[PDB]
Amino acid sequence: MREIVHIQAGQCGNQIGAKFWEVISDEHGIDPTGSYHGDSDLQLERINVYYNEAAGNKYVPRAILVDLEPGTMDSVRSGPFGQIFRPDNFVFGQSGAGNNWAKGHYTEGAELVDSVLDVVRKESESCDCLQGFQLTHSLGGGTGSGMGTLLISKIREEYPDRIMNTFSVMPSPKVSDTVVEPYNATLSVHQLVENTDETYSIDNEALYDICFRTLKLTTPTYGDLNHLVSATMSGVTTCLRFPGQLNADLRKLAVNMVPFPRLHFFMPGFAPLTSRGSQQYRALTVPELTQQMFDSKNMMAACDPRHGRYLTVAAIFRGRMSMKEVDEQMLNVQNKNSSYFVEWIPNNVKTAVCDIPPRGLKMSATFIGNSTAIQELFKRISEQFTAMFRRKAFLHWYTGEGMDEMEFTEAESNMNDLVSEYQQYQ
Amino acid sequence: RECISIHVGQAGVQIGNACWELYCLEHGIQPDGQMDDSFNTFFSETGAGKHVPRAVFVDLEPTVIDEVRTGTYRQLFHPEQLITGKEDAANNYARGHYTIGKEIIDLVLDRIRKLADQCTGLQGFLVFHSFGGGTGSGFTSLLMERLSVDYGKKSKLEFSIYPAPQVSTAVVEPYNSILTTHTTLEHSDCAFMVDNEAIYDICRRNLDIERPTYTNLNRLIGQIVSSITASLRFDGALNVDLTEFQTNLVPYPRIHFPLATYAPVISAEKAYHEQLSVAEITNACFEPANQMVKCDPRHGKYMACCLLYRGDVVPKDVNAAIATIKTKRTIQFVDWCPTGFKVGINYQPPTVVPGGDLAKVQRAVCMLSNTTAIAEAWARLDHKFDLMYAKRAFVHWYVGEGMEEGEFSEAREDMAALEKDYEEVGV
Amino acid sequence: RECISIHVGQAGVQIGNACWELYCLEHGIQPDGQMDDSFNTFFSETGAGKHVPRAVFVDLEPTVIDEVRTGTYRQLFHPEQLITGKEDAANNYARGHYTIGKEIIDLVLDRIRKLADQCTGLQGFLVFHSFGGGTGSGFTSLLMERLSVDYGKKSKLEFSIYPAPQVSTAVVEPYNSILTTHTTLEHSDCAFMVDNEAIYDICRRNLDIERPTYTNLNRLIGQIVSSITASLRFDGALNVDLTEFQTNLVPYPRIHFPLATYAPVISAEKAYHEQLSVAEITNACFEPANQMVKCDPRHGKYMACCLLYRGDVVPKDVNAAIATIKTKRTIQFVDWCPTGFKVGINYQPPTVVPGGDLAKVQRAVCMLSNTTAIAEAWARLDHKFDLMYAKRAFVHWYVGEGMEEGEFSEAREDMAALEKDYEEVGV
Amino acid sequence: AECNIKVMCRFRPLNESEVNRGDKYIAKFQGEDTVVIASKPYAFDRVFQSSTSQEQVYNDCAKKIVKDVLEGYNGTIFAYGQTSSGKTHTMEGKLHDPEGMGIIPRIVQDIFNYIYSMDENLEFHIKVSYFEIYLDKIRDLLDVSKTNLSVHEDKNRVPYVKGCTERFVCSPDEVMDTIDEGKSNRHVAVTNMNEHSSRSHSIFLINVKQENTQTEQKLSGKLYLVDLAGSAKVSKTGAEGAVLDEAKNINKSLSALGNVISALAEGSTYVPYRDSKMTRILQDSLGGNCRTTIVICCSPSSYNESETKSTLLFGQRAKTIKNTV
Ligand SMILES: Nc1nc2c(ncn2[C@@H]2O[C@H](COP(=O)(O)CP(=O)(O)OP(=O)(O)O)[C@@H](O)[C@H]2O)c(=O)[nH]1
Ligand SMILES: Nc1nc2c(ncn2[C@@H]2O[C@H](COP(=O)(O)OP(=O)(O)OP(=O)(O)O)[C@@H](O)[C@H]2O)c(=O)[nH]1
Ligand SMILES: Nc1nc2c(ncn2[C@@H]2O[C@H](COP(=O)(O)OP(=O)(O)OP(=O)(O)O)[C@@H](O)[C@H]2O)c(=O)[nH]1
Ligand SMILES: Nc1ncnc2c1ncn2[C@@H]1O[C@H](COP(=O)(O)OP(=O)(O)OP(=O)(O)O)[C@@H](O)[C@H]1O
């Protein structure tokens, strides 16, 4: 009932998705081998929405892992829960992309798309009725940016009505771990803005800033950053995984958050966030979390929300709590800070609650916001794109793969249009 | 006397599991499903020593249905009545009425007809839903149009939860209510509205419960809809059936939206220190902040109201109470219907849930009062709707379902057609 | 009733670690951080069985912060509240306010607002600082200007340590006080002053402690500021809240500098030999040498004073004491406010620190008294300032920071504007 | 430099289903520029009556448009209206009949007739293309293998279709055989309200590239003939199954351009042409270097009096818009 198929494109997609099955398997009570040892009977109902039942009380996930280099598949297979994944989904080529969007989208990826398209035919048929696809990729690089967005277009041609949710992490000016970030980003958003109905824009700068102020981690690795983003992907897909007083489907947030088809780039966030050295000195009540919810330095995007205005926001709470004090809190943030909300909508806040919180915690929530502050991120990368594109630097490799400079100019026409769209409703 | 109930959406099932919690306790029915004529209007005789409820819990999302199937009231409800869908409406009137509704209404309508065939004294219906949601707005609009053409003459009680002035759970809920009200206006006989924030200050001020949930809310709303049908269950000095509320509340065929208010709502420790009597409850219900809908009654005029009581209440002191309320100049009744009073008494007192915050009282009162105080709400809903309608926001989903701006324009002018006659009769 | 405290500079943290030493002992709070309504105004309930203090210890030099973080009260204070800077103010009002202040006030002000959001009964604030230092003069002037424009209406208790006539720790402390008083005059509602040398002869004469430290001093000052807020913590026959001290002491908006004095201050062996009663303590506080500020009261006249008591003290004998004090011609009350008496009683007696030099007493008293006896101090501070201002000494650092002679000239004439009205009301 | 967009109205007689019901005749004509509907005037350029013939509408509507596209500028033509409004009957009509045809064959016949009058040295290059939208994909009619096509932008950032078939014609008889293949292969449905129900947008683009060898001056003019579908009410039409899937696509297109035409009327800063691909191909019509001609076909019956009201306010709101020509 309302199944979801997980896709993991690119090196970041395989790693960010490996932690997604890590955290949700704990609250569901799934063994590392695949069996079930949960404590509550409520965890057994909606296991089909992400896993497939097997013999011997064993369960396997519907994870479509795809990449062009075999190193990421071997590392994930040797992980904590690497053995639970089925081997036939681990499709992979031999040669990597080398951070080239043209190779993994036209020439190198087209040799691999024929092998993975037949796999999703098997998984889409095994479920009763698919709800939406939860893809994970990164705009940086060529594999996840090129081959990841390719199958977005192919699947949308098959399913012109199903949901296509993606958790896309974008580049940033200060944190630049690759020289080809603006070109890979500019060509990817041309397709994501038209094809996908939902998009969660994540920035690596905020993942470093969020871990400095409140977690106080002195040596945070990639595994620490994955725990933050994986919890947001789990929090959004929790209402259709456990029962609650008001369950919100993934599509019910799409109807509330997406007032126009292109305007779907969301601001992810998470609460509570407190270090081990200050977890005891904090109140887990709803007034404490709500103030930290809409804090300027809480979301997973470097853009300041004070420089924009929220068009619509959501706070899907999670855990046993009284919804009376919730509604007063969402009333206060929109009333006390009405200048930072659009006047042409009466209420910019969505609500949702669940009864069974995660392990170790009592109450929690997850933030999803579509705001005008994101246009500062799309324009700065466009300046990076426009600075190098005007001299045609680092484009001769793209033309070798059958590309043309006209498509780069057409992608710029999509880039400068969507930033002006945010300027209209600001 | 028999009547069939139906619950739709997330709002309905929380009213379903709560309102049916006290009915089985009222008739001494254990939760297993077993223990002469009082329970006939809501429970049938299942052969020998077993009952079955006369309700249908339809919902597109099965996240609530499997909870009830795995809940404590498993053996009570029939497994066929717990109807399940395939995917949620997503706060879309279009998706819950046209695409997902048509492929399941053929099963629901046939299920309603086969249960209604064995009835002999079916008085009417009562619907539990909420226009602010998707399933409660889209699917409820489908069945109401499709059964009204079939039956038509029978009565209907639409128990709809409306949005608050400032409080709101979603952002698209004005679009859900503006469309469904265009269809609900001509077919719904009478719709008793309920507001979500109006319950918040009631329990906070009177019951002094500072962290309740919906389970405390629906236990009160389930008690309210039990008192309006209490005359048919148990005997009374002045009984009133389901057709009584069609005439003395609906003076015009389109003005069929009465307010509601209930009293006494007193906590356990506060009940002993406060004297329960007819005078204060008759004054408490007319108090404006003591209502289930946050709308100023002083901004309009009252058309007609009914004073249905509970417990051992003599018929004389209630007449003196309404007589004294007539003398109070703080209120003002409309000249078009001055004698808009309808007294009613019942011998069976209010029940009490074990562990519930509501206290035991020997007498109670419920109120349905038609007035022109609701026109400010429809005026407010039209103004806030115009802010989003100008920018054409949250429209691409509805036309993406199949709708268009035409019916949206017909829905806007329909409220304008409703604004003029509320102000006209208010003179 | 809630109130948020803030400590600034070297003077604040020695007041912080000392004044909070007895509050946790008053409410039976162990140093680890755990053990119904008396502790609410200074300690919040952190979920279940854990407390957290309502204070912010800001300081540019972290030499005191790491000591408290590695001290014995580590588990009590929130690690986020212990704010740390980057480099000290160097006894420069300009460096602690403009350069170093601006790059950290954005973090401190946001920290104050988020803690004040969850408050419901926030009566006001109380600031601990010292104008003779750099951080206490510069950074405190920044936040007081920046929060007053934000909140404004709320009350503020400035507990500032002033310089002595002949005793002095630094040489630039007149320049620190002359600048900050120009800003503190219009925004600070009421500032209770304390003198450093005034404590020296008190413990030497009464307590006969001939080698104490700041730990003995701040334990007494922490007890003084605990008694002024004691009416809000525990019940009393005649309670007074935080707004009481703003009206009955500040008759004019610029004359807002009351003196302070406290009694009884008796040692352990001397307490058993001396009879504790209301008469001698009521005469002892009005004794001039028994004050926390070395200023001759006989050179002026008293405006108004408050007699707030502690412990089991009946309300009658205190009325007889102030009546007898009115008859004593050794003092002289001003004709503009002859009935400047404000009695106050509290049932909770004074506490005692283990190992401290202060002895247990069944009754105590604290005094805040507005008078014209401070004008001689400001006249002295202007004369000594003129010696350095004429030669333009210690000026190249301030203009080296960014200042100029204009604000220095405006600061000089501001005291001249304060000198005239103190002499005018003294008539 | 600034040419006002013309929005001409037309009515028709009642259909066989309407006269059998007995719908009332609401259309009241006052003059020629304005029309009264329930005591509400609507100022337009030209109001065509129900008794108008196909030729009578053609010589008044798109007669001067032939001169505009041949002079060097561009032309853009597309109708609008609800279901059973008479849009396809106005635009394509009966091709083989001497008089029952619409606008498309009368235009292309006049293009070849006008070319015969001028001098021989003016060399022309007429290329034809025809594609329809189907399940939100540009379905090509001349080639059945292609199910979806990609749209790109030219040098000056005017959107235009790429990869579509471009058959270079030389005689007007070849175009008549081409449109019959497109009309015959067009996916048409059957409903209660309309038999020949055009449930999709059919674009008929003609790129008129001409050159004068004597002066050596090159000129080009685009000619969009885009027939839109009707806003089908499922309560009145009774859509079910595959017809609902047709309803999802067509309603998005008319509502998408409805946001565009309302944005230009109120004077928005962005003008969201990016709402749908149907607006991209029409972006040159509403904000390009082309003359827009909006033929408002409406039914005079009272059975859809509210839909006709929405269509007239839709038309007059478009009259205030001016192109950046
Ligand atoms: N939030 C996270 N971001 C990551 C993680 N790993 C990488 N990244 C970020 O994504 C950027 C590029 O993504 P990838 O690591 O997947 C490069 P890819 O595997 O697609 O190409 P090749 O490895 O060269 O075959 C990368 O520079 C990081 O900024 C991660 O685990 N979590
Ligand atoms: N007072 C009250 N209102 C409820 C309750 N449950 C749901 N609601 C109403 O439901 C509305 C939210 O939308 P839902 O009815 O939950 O919609 P849904 O059934 O979850 O399905 P979708 O609309 O598709 O998301 C709120 O505005 C509430 O007013 C309840 O238990 N008590
Ligand atoms: N009475 C009393 N005064 C104190 C105490 N601690 C500091 N002071 C005051 O502090 C002043 C000295 O300057 P500091 O406050 O130490 O300045 P700082 O914090 O070291 O920073 P800089 O001014 O930049 O050197 C003296 O004039 C004292 O009056 C204390 O414990 N008791
Ligand atoms: N001007 C007219 N005079 C007489 N009959 C007409 C006229 N216009 C249309 N019709 C009738 O309408 C029928 C064809 O309907 P048509 O294809 O025009 O629907 P439509 O309005 O074009 O649909 P849509 O609005 O979806 O394009 C024909 O049978 C024809 O008799």
Residue numbers in the entry:
A (entry chain U): 1 to 426
B (entry chain E), C (entry chain A): 2 to 36, 52 to 443
D (entry chain k): 5 to 329
Please, what does the article write about this entry?
Microtubules are cytoskeletal filaments that play various important roles in cellular processes, including intracellular transport, cell division, and establishment of cell polarity. They are highly dynamic tubular polymers assembled from α/β-tubulin heterodimers, which are arranged in a head-to-tail manner to form protofilaments, with ~13 protofilaments associating laterally to form a hollow polar tube. In vertebrates, both α- and β-tubulins have multiple isotypes encoded by different genes, which are intrinsic factors in regulating microtubule functions. The GTP bound to β-tubulin at the E-site (exchangeable) is hydrolysed within the microtubule assembly proceeding via longitudinal contacts with α-tubulin, while the GTP bound to α-tubulin at the N-site (non-exchangeable) plays a structural role and is never hydrolysed. We determined the cryo-EM maps of α1A/β2A, α1C/β2A, and α4A/β2A microtubules in the dominantly populated 14-protofilament type at the resolution range of 4.2 Å to 4.4 Å.
The α-tubulin isotype α1A is highly expressed in postmitotic neurons but is decreased in postnatal and adult stages. To investigate the architectures of α1A/β2A, α1C/β2A, and α4A/β2A microtubules and explore the impact of α-tubulin isotypes on the structural features of the microtubules, we characterized the structures of the three kinds of microtubules in the presence of GMPCPP by using cryo-EM. The microtubules were decorated with K 349(E236A) to aid in the identification of α- and β-tubulins in the reconstruction process through the “seam-search” protocol. We then built the corresponding atomic model for each of the maps, including the non-seam region and the seam region. Similar analysis of the lateral interaction between α-β and β-α contacts in the seam region suggested that the α1C/β2A microtubules display a subtle longitudinally contracted divergence between α1C and α1A in the seam region; the α4A/β2A microtubules also display a slight longitudinal contraction (Cα atom RMSD of ~1 Å) between α4A and α1A in the seam region. Taken together, our data suggest that these α-tubulin isotypes do not show obvious lateral effects on their microtubule structures, while α1C/β2A and α4A/β2A microtubules exhibit slight longitudinal contraction between the interdimers in the seam region. Due to the longitudinally contracted divergence in the seam region, especially between α1A/β2A and α4A/β2A microtubules, we further compared the structures of α1A/β2A and α1C/β2A and those of α1A/β2A and α4A/β2A in the longitudinal orientation. In the present study, we assembled α1A/β2A and α1C/β2A microtubules, determined their cryo-EM structures, and found that they displayed similar structural features.
